[PDB]
Design a protein around this motif. Sequence first.
Motif, PDB file in Angstrom:
ATOM      1  N   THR A  50     -26.633   9.134  22.154  1.00  0.00           N
ATOM      2  CA  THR A  50     -25.533   8.263  22.539  1.00  0.00           C
ATOM      3  C   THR A  50     -25.875   7.664  23.893  1.00  0.00           C
ATOM      4  OG1 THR A  50     -24.090   9.893  21.482  1.00  0.00           O
ATOM      5  CG2 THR A  50     -23.040   8.051  22.601  1.00  0.00           C
ATOM      6  N   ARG A  51     -25.824   6.345  23.991  1.00  0.00           N
ATOM      7  CA  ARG A  51     -26.264   5.657  25.193  1.00  0.00           C
ATOM      8  C   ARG A  51     -25.076   5.215  26.042  1.00  0.00           C
ATOM      9  NH1 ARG A  51     -28.458  -0.293  23.059  1.00  0.00           N
ATOM     10  NH2 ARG A  51     -26.416  -0.927  22.247  1.00  0.00           N
ATOM     11  N   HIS A  52     -25.394   4.784  27.268  1.00  0.00           N
ATOM     12  CA  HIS A  52     -24.419   4.431  28.306  1.00  0.00           C
ATOM     13  C   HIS A  52     -23.688   5.664  28.837  1.00  0.00           C
ATOM     14  CE1 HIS A  52     -24.259   0.702  25.532  1.00  0.00           C
ATOM     15  NE2 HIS A  52     -25.248   0.541  26.390  1.00  0.00           N
ATOM     16  N   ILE A  53     -24.392   6.791  28.918  1.00  0.00           N
ATOM     17  CA  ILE A  53     -23.837   8.036  29.438  1.00  0.00           C
ATOM     18  C   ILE A  53     -24.764   8.565  30.520  1.00  0.00           C
ATOM     19  CG2 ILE A  53     -23.151  10.398  28.925  1.00  0.00           C
ATOM     20  CD1 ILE A  53     -22.650   9.447  26.042  1.00  0.00           C
ATOM     21  N   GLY A  54     -24.196   8.926  31.665  1.00  0.00           N
ATOM     22  CA  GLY A  54     -24.975   9.533  32.724  1.00  0.00           C
ATOM     23  C   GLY A  54     -24.322   9.456  34.085  1.00  0.00           C
ATOM     24  N   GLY A  55     -24.409  10.537  34.847  1.00  0.00           N
ATOM     25  CA  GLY A  55     -23.872  10.561  36.190  1.00  0.00           C
ATOM     26  C   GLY A  55     -22.456  11.095  36.245  1.00  0.00           C
ATOM     27  N   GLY A  56     -21.759  10.695  37.297  1.00  0.00           N
ATOM     28  CA  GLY A  56     -20.380  11.081  37.493  1.00  0.00           C
ATOM     29  C   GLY A  56     -20.236  12.298  38.380  1.00  0.00           C
ATOM     30  N   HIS A  57     -19.007  12.791  38.433  1.00  0.00           N
ATOM     31  CA  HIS A  57     -18.660  13.927  39.268  1.00  0.00           C
ATOM     32  C   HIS A  57     -18.898  15.239  38.530  1.00  0.00           C
ATOM     33  CE1 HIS A  57     -16.690  15.961  42.610  1.00  0.00           C
ATOM     34  NE2 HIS A  57     -16.526  14.789  43.194  1.00  0.00           N
ATOM     35  N   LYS A  58     -18.999  16.308  39.310  1.00  0.00           N
ATOM     36  CA  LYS A  58     -19.145  17.647  38.765  1.00  0.00           C
ATOM     37  C   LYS A  58     -17.789  18.177  38.313  1.00  0.00           C
ATOM     38  CE  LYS A  58     -21.393  21.980  40.083  1.00  0.00           C
ATOM     39  NZ  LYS A  58     -22.173  22.615  41.174  1.00  0.00           N
ATOM     40  N   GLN A  59     -17.762  18.818  37.146  1.00  0.00           N
ATOM     41  CA  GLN A  59     -16.510  19.244  36.537  1.00  0.00           C
ATOM     42  C   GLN A  59     -16.619  20.672  36.028  1.00  0.00           C
ATOM     43  OE1 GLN A  59     -15.971  16.443  33.403  1.00  0.00           O
ATOM     44  NE2 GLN A  59     -15.361  14.760  34.745  1.00  0.00           N
ATOM     45  N   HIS A  60     -15.499  21.381  36.089  1.00  0.00           N
ATOM     46  CA  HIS A  60     -15.313  22.644  35.396  1.00  0.00           C
ATOM     47  C   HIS A  60     -14.572  22.402  34.090  1.00  0.00           C
ATOM     48  CE1 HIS A  60     -15.751  25.070  39.350  1.00  0.00           C
ATOM     49  NE2 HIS A  60     -16.844  25.211  38.622  1.00  0.00           N
ATOM     50  N   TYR A  61     -14.735  23.329  33.156  1.00  0.00           N
ATOM     51  CA  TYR A  61     -14.028  23.276  31.888  1.00  0.00           C
ATOM     52  C   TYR A  61     -12.808  24.184  31.951  1.00  0.00           C
ATOM     53  CZ  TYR A  61     -12.914  23.560  26.968  1.00  0.00           C
ATOM     54  OH  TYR A  61     -12.261  23.520  25.761  1.00  0.00           O
ATOM     55  N   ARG A  62     -11.650  23.644  31.591  1.00  0.00           N
ATOM     56  CA  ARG A  62     -10.414  24.411  31.523  1.00  0.00           C
ATOM     57  C   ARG A  62     -10.211  24.879  30.090  1.00  0.00           C
ATOM     58  NH1 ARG A  62     -11.561  21.616  36.235  1.00  0.00           N
ATOM     59  NH2 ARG A  62      -9.862  21.809  37.752  1.00  0.00           N
ATOM     60  N   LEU A  63     -10.091  26.191  29.908  1.00  0.00           N
ATOM     61  CA  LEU A  63      -9.900  26.777  28.583  1.00  0.00           C
ATOM     62  C   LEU A  63      -8.456  26.554  28.160  1.00  0.00           C
ATOM     63  CD1 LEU A  63     -11.651  30.069  29.609  1.00  0.00           C
ATOM     64  CD2 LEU A  63     -12.725  28.327  28.193  1.00  0.00           C
ATOM     65  N   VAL A  64      -8.222  25.445  27.469  1.00  0.00           N
ATOM     66  CA  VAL A  64      -6.887  25.097  27.002  1.00  0.00           C
ATOM     67  C   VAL A  64      -6.632  25.794  25.674  1.00  0.00           C
ATOM     68  CG1 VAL A  64      -5.470  23.223  26.121  1.00  0.00           C
ATOM     69  CG2 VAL A  64      -6.734  22.927  28.238  1.00  0.00           C
ATOM     70  N   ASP A  65      -5.461  26.410  25.545  1.00  0.00           N
ATOM     71  CA  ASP A  65      -5.080  27.091  24.314  1.00  0.00           C
ATOM     72  C   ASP A  65      -4.574  26.059  23.315  1.00  0.00           C
ATOM     73  OD1 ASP A  65      -4.303  28.901  22.364  1.00  0.00           O
ATOM     74  OD2 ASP A  65      -2.382  29.316  23.338  1.00  0.00           O
ATOM     75  N   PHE A  66      -5.373  25.786  22.285  1.00  0.00           N
ATOM     76  CA  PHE A  66      -4.995  24.846  21.241  1.00  0.00           C
ATOM     77  C   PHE A  66      -4.370  25.522  20.030  1.00  0.00           C
ATOM     78  CE2 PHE A  66      -8.206  22.065  23.321  1.00  0.00           C
ATOM     79  CZ  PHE A  66      -7.375  20.999  23.560  1.00  0.00           C
ATOM     80  N   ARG A  67      -4.384  26.852  19.970  1.00  0.00           N
ATOM     81  CA  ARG A  67      -3.824  27.571  18.832  1.00  0.00           C
ATOM     82  C   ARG A  67      -2.360  27.937  19.038  1.00  0.00           C
ATOM     83  NH1 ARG A  67      -7.549  32.045  16.133  1.00  0.00           N
ATOM     84  NH2 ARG A  67      -5.588  31.946  14.958  1.00  0.00           N
ATOM     85  N   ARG A  68      -2.002  28.414  20.232  1.00  0.00           N
ATOM     86  CA  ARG A  68      -0.630  28.804  20.566  1.00  0.00           C
ATOM     87  C   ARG A  68      -0.093  29.829  19.567  1.00  0.00           C
ATOM     88  NH1 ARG A  68       3.752  24.594  22.976  1.00  0.00           N
ATOM     89  NH2 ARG A  68       4.785  26.616  23.256  1.00  0.00           N
ATOM     90  N   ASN A  69      -0.739  30.993  19.552  1.00  0.00           N
ATOM     91  CA  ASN A  69      -0.455  32.032  18.573  1.00  0.00           C
ATOM     92  C   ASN A  69       0.192  33.271  19.184  1.00  0.00           C
ATOM     93  OD1 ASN A  69      -2.607  33.139  19.929  1.00  0.00           O
ATOM     94  ND2 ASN A  69      -4.006  33.147  18.178  1.00  0.00           N
ATOM     95  N   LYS A  70       0.881  33.121  20.316  1.00  0.00           N
ATOM     96  CA  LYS A  70       1.698  34.196  20.877  1.00  0.00           C
ATOM     97  C   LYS A  70       3.142  33.943  20.460  1.00  0.00           C
ATOM     98  CE  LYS A  70       1.391  36.109  24.884  1.00  0.00           C
ATOM     99  NZ  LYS A  70       1.050  37.533  24.622  1.00  0.00           N
ATOM    100  N   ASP A  71       3.427  34.233  19.196  1.00  0.00           N
ATOM    101  CA  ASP A  71       4.721  33.911  18.614  1.00  0.00           C
ATOM    102  C   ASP A  71       5.760  34.948  19.017  1.00  0.00           C
ATOM    103  OD1 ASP A  71       2.651  33.304  15.855  1.00  0.00           O
ATOM    104  OD2 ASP A  71       3.547  31.710  17.069  1.00  0.00           O
ATOM    105  N   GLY A  72       6.925  34.473  19.449  1.00  0.00           N
ATOM    106  CA  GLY A  72       8.026  35.358  19.771  1.00  0.00           C
ATOM    107  C   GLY A  72       8.211  35.621  21.250  1.00  0.00           C
ATOM    108  N   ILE A  73       7.115  35.744  21.986  1.00  0.00           N
ATOM    109  CA  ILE A  73       7.193  36.023  23.421  1.00  0.00           C
ATOM    110  C   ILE A  73       7.556  34.735  24.155  1.00  0.00           C
ATOM    111  CG2 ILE A  73       5.905  36.741  25.445  1.00  0.00           C
ATOM    112  CD1 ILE A  73       4.620  37.893  22.141  1.00  0.00           C
ATOM    113  N   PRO A  74       8.570  34.746  25.014  1.00  0.00           N
ATOM    114  CA  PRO A  74       8.894  33.546  25.793  1.00  0.00           C
ATOM    115  C   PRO A  74       7.867  33.293  26.887  1.00  0.00           C
ATOM    116  CG  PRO A  74      10.740  35.104  25.711  1.00  0.00           C
ATOM    117  CD  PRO A  74       9.534  35.832  25.239  1.00  0.00           C
ATOM    118  N   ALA A  75       7.865  32.057  27.377  1.00  0.00           N
ATOM    119  CA  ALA A  75       6.952  31.624  28.423  1.00  0.00           C
ATOM    120  C   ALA A  75       7.715  30.828  29.473  1.00  0.00           C
ATOM    121  CB  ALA A  75       5.802  30.787  27.854  1.00  0.00           C
TER     122      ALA A  75
END
Lengths: 272, 44
Positions: A50-75
């Motif tokens: 894939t072209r036109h990609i390169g450079g930019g700022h340094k980033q960390h990855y945030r582990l986002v919960d996409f499943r949401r499987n803690k059913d019943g417990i409030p947040a």
Amino acid sequence: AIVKCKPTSAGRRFVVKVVNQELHKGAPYAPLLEKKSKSGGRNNNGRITTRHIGGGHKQHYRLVDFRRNKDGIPAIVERVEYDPNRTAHIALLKYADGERRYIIAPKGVAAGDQLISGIGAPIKAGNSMPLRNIPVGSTVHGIELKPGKGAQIARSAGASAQLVAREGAYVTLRLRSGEMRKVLAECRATLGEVSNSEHSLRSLGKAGATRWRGVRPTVRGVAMNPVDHPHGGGEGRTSAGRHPVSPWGLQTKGKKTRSNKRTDNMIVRRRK
Amino acid sequence: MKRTFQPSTLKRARVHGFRARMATKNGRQVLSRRRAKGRKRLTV
RNA sequence: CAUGCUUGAGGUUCUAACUCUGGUCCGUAAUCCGGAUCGAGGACAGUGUAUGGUGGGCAGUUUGACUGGGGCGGUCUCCU
RNA sequence: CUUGUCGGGUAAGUUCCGACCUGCACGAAUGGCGUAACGAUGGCGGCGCUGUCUCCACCCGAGACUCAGUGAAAUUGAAA
RNA sequence: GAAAGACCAAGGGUUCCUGCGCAACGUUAAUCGACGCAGGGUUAGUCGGUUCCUAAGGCGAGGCUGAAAAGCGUAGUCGAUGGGAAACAGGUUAAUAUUCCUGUACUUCUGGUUACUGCGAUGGAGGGACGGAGAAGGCUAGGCCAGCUUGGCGUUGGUUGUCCAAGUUUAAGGUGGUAGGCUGAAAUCUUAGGUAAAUCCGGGGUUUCAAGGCCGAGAGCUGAUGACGAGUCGUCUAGAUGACGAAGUGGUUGAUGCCAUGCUUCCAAGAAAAGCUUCUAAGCUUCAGGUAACCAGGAACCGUACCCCAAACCGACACAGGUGGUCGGGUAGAGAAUACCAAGGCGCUUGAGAGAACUCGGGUGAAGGAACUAGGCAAAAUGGCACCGUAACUUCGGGAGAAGGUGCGCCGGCUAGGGUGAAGGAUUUACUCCGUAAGCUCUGGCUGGUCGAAGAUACCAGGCCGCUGCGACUGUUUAUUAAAAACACAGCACUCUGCAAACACGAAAGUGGACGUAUAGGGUGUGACGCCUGCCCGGUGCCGGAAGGUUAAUUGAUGG
RNA sequence: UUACCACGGAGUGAUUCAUGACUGGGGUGAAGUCGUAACAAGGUAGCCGUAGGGGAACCUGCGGCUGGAUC
Ligand SMILES: [Mg+2]
Ligand SMILES: [Mg+2]
Ligand SMILES: [Mg+2]
Ligand SMILES: [Mg+2]
Ligand SMILES: [Mg+2]
Ligand SMILES: [Mg+2]
Ligand SMILES: [Mg+2]
Ligand SMILES: [Mg+2]
Ligand SMILES: [Mg+2]
Ligand SMILES: [Mg+2]
Ligand SMILES: [Mg+2]
Ligand SMILES: [Mg+2]
Ligand SMILES: [Mg+2]
Ligand SMILES: [Mg+2]
Ligand SMILES: [Mg+2]
Ligand SMILES: [Mg+2]
Ligand SMILES: [Mg+2]
Ligand SMILES: [Mg+2]
Ligand SMILES: [Mg+2]
Ligand SMILES: [Mg+2]
Ligand SMILES: [Mg+2]
Ligand SMILES: [Mg+2]
Ligand SMILES: [Mg+2]
Ligand SMILES: [Mg+2]
Ligand SMILES: [Mg+2]
Ligand SMILES: [Mg+2]
Ligand SMILES: [Mg+2]
Ligand SMILES: [Mg+2]
Ligand SMILES: [Mg+2]
Ligand SMILES: [Mg+2]
Ligand SMILES: [Mg+2]
Ligand SMILES: [Mg+2]
Ligand SMILES: [Mg+2]
Ligand SMILES: [Mg+2]
Ligand SMILES: [Mg+2]
Ligand SMILES: [Mg+2]
Ligand SMILES: [Mg+2]
Ligand SMILES: [Mg+2]
Ligand SMILES: [Mg+2]
Ligand SMILES: [Mg+2]
Ligand SMILES: [Mg+2]
Ligand SMILES: [Mg+2]
Ligand SMILES: [Mg+2]
Ligand SMILES: [Mg+2]
Ligand SMILES: [Mg+2]
Ligand SMILES: [Mg+2]
Ligand SMILES: [Mg+2]
Ligand SMILES: [Mg+2]
Ligand SMILES: [Mg+2]
Ligand SMILES: [Mg+2]
Ligand SMILES: [Mg+2]
Ligand SMILES: [Mg+2]
Ligand SMILES: [Mg+2]
Ligand SMILES: [Mg+2]
Ligand SMILES: [Mg+2]
Ligand SMILES: [Mg+2]
Ligand SMILES: [Mg+2]
Ligand SMILES: [Mg+2]
Ligand SMILES: [Mg+2]
Ligand SMILES: [Mg+2]
Ligand SMILES: [Mg+2]
Ligand SMILES: [Mg+2]
Ligand SMILES: [Mg+2]
Ligand SMILES: [Mg+2]
Ligand SMILES: [Mg+2]
Ligand SMILES: [Mg+2]
Ligand SMILES: [Mg+2]
Ligand SMILES: [Mg+2]
Ligand SMILES: [Mg+2]
Ligand SMILES: [Mg+2]
Ligand SMILES: [Mg+2]
Ligand SMILES: [Mg+2]
Ligand SMILES: [Mg+2]
Ligand SMILES: [Mg+2]
Ligand SMILES: [Mg+2]
Ligand SMILES: [Mg+2]
Ligand SMILES: [Mg+2]
Ligand SMILES: [Mg+2]
Ligand SMILES: [Mg+2]
Ligand SMILES: [Mg+2]
Ligand SMILES: [Mg+2]
Ligand SMILES: [Mg+2]
Ligand SMILES: [Mg+2]
Ligand SMILES: [Mg+2]
Ligand SMILES: [Mg+2]
Ligand SMILES: [Mg+2]
Ligand SMILES: [Mg+2]
Ligand SMILES: [Mg+2]
Ligand SMILES: [Mg+2]
Ligand SMILES: [Mg+2]
Ligand SMILES: [Mg+2]
Ligand SMILES: [Mg+2]
Ligand SMILES: [Mg+2]
Ligand SMILES: [Mg+2]
Ligand SMILES: [Mg+2]
Ligand SMILES: [Mg+2]
Ligand SMILES: [Mg+2]
Ligand SMILES: [Mg+2]
Ligand SMILES: [Mg+2]
Ligand SMILES: [Mg+2]
Ligand SMILES: [Mg+2]
Ligand SMILES: [Mg+2]
Ligand SMILES: [Mg+2]
Ligand SMILES: [Mg+2]
Ligand SMILES: [Mg+2]
Ligand SMILES: [Mg+2]
Ligand SMILES: [Mg+2]
Ligand SMILES: [Mg+2]
Ligand SMILES: [Mg+2]
Ligand SMILES: [Mg+2]
Ligand SMILES: [Mg+2]
Ligand SMILES: [Mg+2]
Ligand SMILES: [Mg+2]
Ligand SMILES: [Mg+2]
Ligand SMILES: [Mg+2]
Ligand SMILES: [Mg+2]
Ligand SMILES: [Mg+2]
Ligand SMILES: [Mg+2]
Ligand SMILES: [Mg+2]
Ligand SMILES: [Mg+2]
Ligand SMILES: [Mg+2]
């Protein structure tokens, strides 16, 4: 909100920033972070795929919960943060027993809320439950396509889908693209719309703002030689004397490219 | 003016060294070809 | 006409072949890979072989001679 | 065709600026017409400044020249 | 002299020092040499490696894939340009020194003895651990001045004195917890969590107090009655050697170095792992192990010479070239510019003449002032700080330092402030608060005088203005004849793609897109902004339709 | 010799007259050409504002008025 900048410089005349004062301005939650390194668009053969990609700022990855499987417990919503690798905001939930997590923030959640999930949850925005016990005509986001896989659809900023019909073991919903699709009713979704809907009003303003995001310049094929592009060649300016085409010989002004034939039965009607 | 050869002994051994030739068959053919000729050096 | 026995084509449905870059258990100290079991699709998809269409994406080549220099024009065989 | 014709600028202007329309053979995202700021970008005109020039003169250093030392090159059928 | 001086790294490899030499090498000669011959020279628990840990990336048991070779990859284990224990000053060689010697330190491990004890990871938590810009400080190195000590009294007017020269040095470590930064603390009862457990972390409820806790330059004291120190005495051979050896204090200024991985603020949202602290699991439990104190002992191996912005590295050369990082004084100056100097180093390995044309690099030029030329090419000119003043047009930022103008040296008189800072005052009674005369230092105001042709006096240091074409701008491009009107660009539009996405690299496994999800991703054209973007679907393409005609392998009636 | 100051000089603006290749509408004039927009219900009721279109009077859309005829 959207903020316009004074034309103090030539590079500031057309900058339109999107600044949110309610975003957290401390450090992100450290246990939910992990490193990610750039690729430049290169695969394990080392070739640009894939072209036109390169450079930019340094980033960390945030582990986002996409499943949401803690059913019943409030947040509780502890804060709403900035994600370098989304276009939407993220929210740090704190469940009734520690257990802090990242999710995709809905439009209305700011600092309190309860955001419970599972069967029996109310119909407030930010709650999650299976698509079968969701009233028809409602607006949902973060729809999963396989049970236990996690959210796949309607995750970008301002994204949503509408629940239109329900019959059998499947359910029909209208996607943001205009496409009618049927999803398994055992799958899950979240009520409401994704935050940061004003993201589409920004204006980068200058060429260097695109380089900050890791995007490299695009050279037109009519500016090349015949050996590099099918559009190249000619004396003076020319207009690609053939039908417009990809660098690898594929027509690009309206020719369809979908050839799955395995998921064809899940399409109620195409977006066209 | 900058010239083509900029020496570095660590980059020299990692490209042309003995253990680099032995890692692949095409480098092992180079070594056996240089042994048949009688080369005194035999490696970078 | 009523059936019997095949067999061309279509639709629907089922699970048992196949598929899963879905879940959880084990090998195991492991986001690979296998085996087990739930879930989903399902004789479709996909692959082999045979065949029609498309295909400068890529390849091997061809693109005559005469000629008051070549090109353009004209001529190239037969009869008076 | 063409240094088209008219006006301005010069003592005198095939270049320049403003018009005319008879567009050999402009023209609307191979975008049309404008546009502040910007440009080691193209054309034209002024002030200052001057050896650019009329038209060169003198002076100062490094070579050229002579003496001592070291010591090439392209070329070359043969030369009274 | 912000190097042409010192020092690291890479690279080189004996070029380093001494004795003997001059054939060749050195663009000349050479008694000299980075040259020939022969000897000598590199001393580490603390410096740099190795050893411990990981990044990009490599390899990769089994594994999956592939005509074969082989490709990808899991467990794992390699890989610094990064993280992780600890030394400084003074002597000494022809050649080494943070390594040897002298003095004073610090770190870590091993073995014994005693005393007291719940030990234990590959696993859980904490920590390690980090962006751009900016701004207030506090401090130190360094620099000046004054005083002190020693010496001197000047080839020519004066110089026993508000004179001249030199020196006035001193580390790590220890003690000290300061300028300053962050943070609520404790007890008790519990627990849908941290895969199992947990006294650890996280969550919840109750009561009490406004006080703790963690970081942190630097000052002072001590190291140090010691070293160092101009010089004096003695001895020996024009120098070495042993002993001795004066003063060694105060005031200002002050960093780009340290506090600082701090603080504030902004989007483009800013490494990992181990060492380290803590918790328990499997196991021991009177043996193992752990915690203190004392005694004894150890800290292996490798590199240390020399050049190092160059005559030793990369350029065939003792080659106007290139080569990463550190230090960097005085007088002027905004300054690491520039000029003249310091420490330190050098005069660039052919010279001597003479003073033609012509060539190169410069200085001055009468009267004209672009008449030169394709073209003001080149040269000349402008140039600083403060103050006054400044047009069309504009996207309201700009244009603009537009244009143009006034002052500027030195010596007196009067006068306004800021910083530092004795004595005094407070009590929070000592690394504290207020505040100080003199001294030192910094910034002004208005009044005269005076010299020269000329006071931003040298070096240094914008020429400006008016019409037009093109491209919105900053940027990029043909290494070595083209820097542009060409490419990119922010903005605009069309089109494809529902995720095992389209698309791309791969006989394939797989990988990128993307740990993204239509406000996203790919391709194509146009190219800020303003006003706009008209007509044609006949051709060619793309999209949709499916009735009817043709239409492949396949099948095999019929006839011969 | 100093101060004041007229003439004169330099730079940059403002305002006002005259003139200018070429262009835009207006008024008037002659038995000119094309249409018939208005006045009757003028033969699609006319006017007002606004937008698009057209050789031209004008047409069409949206909103408004009666200063509109038969009933
Ligand atoms: Mg982390
Ligand atoms: Mg792209
Ligand atoms: Mg991103
Ligand atoms: Mg683009
Ligand atoms: Mg482009
Ligand atoms: Mg393109
Ligand atoms: Mg081009
Ligand atoms: Mg080209
Ligand atoms: Mg290519
Ligand atoms: Mg082609
Ligand atoms: Mg072209
Ligand atoms: Mg052309
Ligand atoms: Mg063409
Ligand atoms: Mg994939
Ligand atoms: Mg599995
Ligand atoms: Mg099943
Ligand atoms: Mg099938
Ligand atoms: Mg098939
Ligand atoms: Mg097939
Ligand atoms: Mg098939
Ligand atoms: Mg071709
Ligand atoms: Mg071809
Ligand atoms: Mg063909
Ligand atoms: Mg081809
Ligand atoms: Mg051939
Ligand atoms: Mg050929
Ligand atoms: Mg042929
Ligand atoms: Mg021929
Ligand atoms: Mg001919
Ligand atoms: Mg001829
Ligand atoms: Mg011919
Ligand atoms: Mg012409
Ligand atoms: Mg002309
Ligand atoms: Mg003319
Ligand atoms: Mg001219
Ligand atoms: Mg068009
Ligand atoms: Mg054109
Ligand atoms: Mg134009
Ligand atoms: Mg530029
Ligand atoms: Mg211009
Ligand atoms: Mg002229
Ligand atoms: Mg001679
Ligand atoms: Mg070395
Ligand atoms: Mg060498
Ligand atoms: Mg030597
Ligand atoms: Mg000698
Ligand atoms: Mg001799
Ligand atoms: Mg010689
Ligand atoms: Mg020697
Ligand atoms: Mg690895
Ligand atoms: Mg491998
Ligand atoms: Mg194997
Ligand atoms: Mg390792
Ligand atoms: Mg390192
Ligand atoms: Mg030395
Ligand atoms: Mg010692
Ligand atoms: Mg333990
Ligand atoms: Mg850990
Ligand atoms: Mg770091
Ligand atoms: Mg910073
Ligand atoms: Mg001082
Ligand atoms: Mg004295
Ligand atoms: Mg004297
Ligand atoms: Mg005298
Ligand atoms: Mg001291
Ligand atoms: Mg100390
Ligand atoms: Mg404090
Ligand atoms: Mg050494
Ligand atoms: Mg040394
Ligand atoms: Mg050096
Ligand atoms: Mg040097
Ligand atoms: Mg050399
Ligand atoms: Mg030399
Ligand atoms: Mg050199
Ligand atoms: Mg200096
Ligand atoms: Mg200066
Ligand atoms: Mg300098
Ligand atoms: Mg000196
Ligand atoms: Mg001479
Ligand atoms: Mg001369
Ligand atoms: Mg000359
Ligand atoms: Mg001159
Ligand atoms: Mg003179
Ligand atoms: Mg003259
Ligand atoms: Mg004169
Ligand atoms: Mg003159
Ligand atoms: Mg003049
Ligand atoms: Mg002329
Ligand atoms: Mg002439
Ligand atoms: Mg010039
Ligand atoms: Mg000059
Ligand atoms: Mg201007
Ligand atoms: Mg000025
Ligand atoms: Mg100007
Ligand atoms: Mg005078
Ligand atoms: Mg124009
Ligand atoms: Mg032009
Ligand atoms: Mg440009
Ligand atoms: Mg720039
Ligand atoms: Mg480049
Ligand atoms: Mg370049
Ligand atoms: Mg070039
Ligand atoms: Mg340029
Ligand atoms: Mg050039
Ligand atoms: Mg280009
Ligand atoms: Mg798109
Ligand atoms: Mg273009
Ligand atoms: Mg254009
Ligand atoms: Mg058509
Ligand atoms: Mg068509
Ligand atoms: Mg069709
Ligand atoms: Mg009408
Ligand atoms: Mg009318
Ligand atoms: Mg009418
Ligand atoms: Mg009418
Ligand atoms: Mg009519
Ligand atoms: Mg009006
Ligand atoms: Mg109307
Ligand atoms: Mg109409
Ligand atoms: Mg109406
Ligand atoms: Mg109406």
